[PDB]
Design an enzyme around this catalytic site. Structure first.
Site, PDB file in Angstrom:
ATOM      1  N   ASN D  42      30.870  12.572  12.325  1.00 34.24           N
ATOM      2  CA  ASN D  42      31.141  13.837  12.959  1.00 34.24           C
ATOM      3  C   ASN D  42      31.789  14.818  11.965  1.00 34.24           C
ATOM      4  O   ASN D  42      32.492  14.388  11.029  1.00 34.24           O
ATOM      5  CB  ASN D  42      31.872  13.653  14.319  1.00 34.24           C
ATOM      6  N   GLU D  44      33.789  18.597  12.058  1.00 32.82           N
ATOM      7  CA  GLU D  44      34.438  19.567  12.983  1.00 32.82           C
ATOM      8  C   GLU D  44      34.610  20.969  12.396  1.00 32.82           C
ATOM      9  O   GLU D  44      34.461  21.174  11.182  1.00 32.82           O
ATOM     10  CB  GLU D  44      35.835  19.055  13.424  1.00 32.82           C
ATOM     11  N   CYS D  53      28.242  16.063  15.878  1.00 34.09           N
ATOM     12  CA  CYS D  53      28.384  14.625  16.081  1.00 34.09           C
ATOM     13  C   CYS D  53      27.686  13.751  15.100  1.00 34.09           C
ATOM     14  O   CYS D  53      26.654  14.108  14.554  1.00 34.09           O
ATOM     15  CB  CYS D  53      27.879  14.262  17.452  1.00 34.09           C
ATOM     16  N   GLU D  55      25.827  11.145  15.361  1.00 32.89           N
ATOM     17  CA  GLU D  55      24.452  10.733  15.686  1.00 32.89           C
ATOM     18  C   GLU D  55      23.464  11.783  15.159  1.00 32.89           C
ATOM     19  O   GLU D  55      22.426  11.448  14.565  1.00 32.89           O
ATOM     20  CB  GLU D  55      24.266  10.616  17.205  1.00 32.89           C
TER      21      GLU D  55
HETATM   22 ZN    ZN Z   1      27.565  13.979  20.492  1.00 33.87          ZN
END
Ligand code: ZN
Ligand code: ZN
Ligand code: ZN
Ligand code: ZN
Lengths: 124, 124, 124, 124
Positions: D42, D44, D53, D55
Site C-alpha cells: 500500500n 498512502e 492498496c 493488491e
Molecule cells: Zn484495497
C-alpha cells in the site's frame, strides 16, 4: 414508503446524471429512519478515475445534511438484469449503513433484486 | 451575496463532516448563477482511498439537483494559512466549472486567498 | 540519462497500456537518483472511477521496490500538444517527489514541454 | 509453488509500504500462469482519497510488464483474523483476473483464509 416508491425516486434521480463519456445513466434513492429520501446520480470526469457513482452521491448528500440513520437504498440502471453496485460503492455503503440495510437493485423493465449491504460485501 | 457570506456558509457546512480517521473537518459552499447555495463536507472511509472531499460533495449535490452553472466556491479548514484543494478536487472543478469561476480559500482565523479554478490547475 | 532517452522509455512503457474503454494509451518513465528507470502505463476498469494512470503505476512500482529518491519523470500520449498530468496524479507526484523534480511532457510527434512537480500544482 | 510460499512473498512485500498516516502496512504477491511473482504494498497520500492498496500495486505492476494471466494472489496484514480486500480492490481483481483465481488472506500469526476472486464480489 415501500420499495416500489423508492425505486421510482431512483428512476427520477437518474434523469439528472452527468455522463458524456459513457453515456450510461445511473440513479439512487436513500431513505432515512425518519422517512426522508436523498436522490443521487453518477457524475463523470474526462479523467475517468474521478468519476462518481449515484450511490455515493446520494450518501454524501445525506451525511452533508446531518442525516446518519439509513433504512434502505434503491439503485436503477437500463441493464438487462439488475446490476449490483461496483465494489467501491459497496465499501462506502458498509461504512455508512448497517449490515441489514435493504438494497433494491432494479432496471427500467420491472426486474428487481432485493439484497442487503452486508451480503453485498462478504467479510467487510 | 459576496465572498464573506459564502465563506460563512462553508464554515457551517464543515460542521457536518464525517472524519473519524483524520479528525480533520473541511467545508465548502457553492454558489449558482441564480444565487442558490450548495454546502458540502468531507466524508471519510476506513479504506482511506474511498474518502470524499468537501468540494466534491457540494458539486455532486448541485449536479444531482439539476444545477450546472456555478459562479463561485468557498472552501474552509482549520489550517494556519488557507489551503487549496487537493489535485483530485481541482480536476473535478475544471470539468464542472468555468476557468474564471472564483475560488475563496479561507481558514477559521481571518486568512483569505481568492483565486480561480483555472489558476489552480495550470494547463488543464 | 537525458530527457530524450527517458521519453523513449515512456514511449515503450505506453505500448503495455490496458485501455478497452477509452482506447487512449498513456506511458511514463521515472528515473531515480541512482539512474534506474521505472516504466508505467494506464490501467482501466469498466467501473471508471477505478481507472489508474501511467504516472501512478510507475511511482507505486518504484516505492514497492524500496526506491524513494526521484530525479525526473517523462509522460507520453498521442495528443496534439503535450498534455500535463491529471490533478490526481499531480497530487501523488507531490507526495513522493520534490518540488524541483523534472517533468517532461511529450507526444508522439516530437513536442516537448519541460516543467516541475511544484509548478504543476500551485500551493501544494 | 504453493500457498505458503506466496504468503511469504507478501510478508516480504509488506515491508516496503509507504504509510505515514495510517501506519498500517499491507503486502500482496501475485502469481502468473508461468510462475512469475509480482509483489506490492500500500502507498498512502496526505489526501486520503489518493491512497493505493497493495493488491492494486501488484496487479498494475504485472500489467505494466506485459503479464495478464494470473493464477493466484496472497494478501497479508497485522490483523487479528485475516481481512479481505476493500471493495475497490475487489473490483480491480474482477477486471484483471478470472473468477476462479485463488485468493489467500493471511495475517502474521498463522491465520489463513483461502477464497476466490468471484466469491469475494457476488454478482460482479
Ligand atoms: Zn484495497
Ligand atoms: Zn459504484
Ligand atoms: Zn480534495
Ligand atoms: Zn492521472
Amino acid at each position: 414508503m415501500n420499495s416500489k416508491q423508492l425505486i421510482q425516486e431512483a428512476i427520477e434521480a437518474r434523469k439528472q446524471a452527468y455522463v458524456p463519456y459513457s453515456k450510461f445513466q445511473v440513479g439512487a434513492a436513500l431513505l432515512t429512519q425518519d422517512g426522508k429520501v436523498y436522490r443521487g446520480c453518477n457524475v463523470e470526469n474526462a479523467s475517468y478515475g474521478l468519476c462518481n457513482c449515484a450511490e455515493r452521491t446520494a450518501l454524501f448528500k445525506a451525511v452533508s445534511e446531518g442525516d446518519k440513520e439509513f433504512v434502505a437504498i434503491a439503485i436503477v440502471a437500463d441493464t438487462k438484469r439488475p446490476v449490483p453496485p461496483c465494489g467501491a460503492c459497496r465499501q462506502v455503503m458498509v461504512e455508512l449503513c448497517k449490515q441489514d440495510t435493504k438494497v433494491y437493485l432494479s432496471n427500467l423493465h420491472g426486474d428487481v433484486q432485493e439484497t442487503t449491504v452486508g451480503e453485498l460485501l462478504p467479510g467487510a
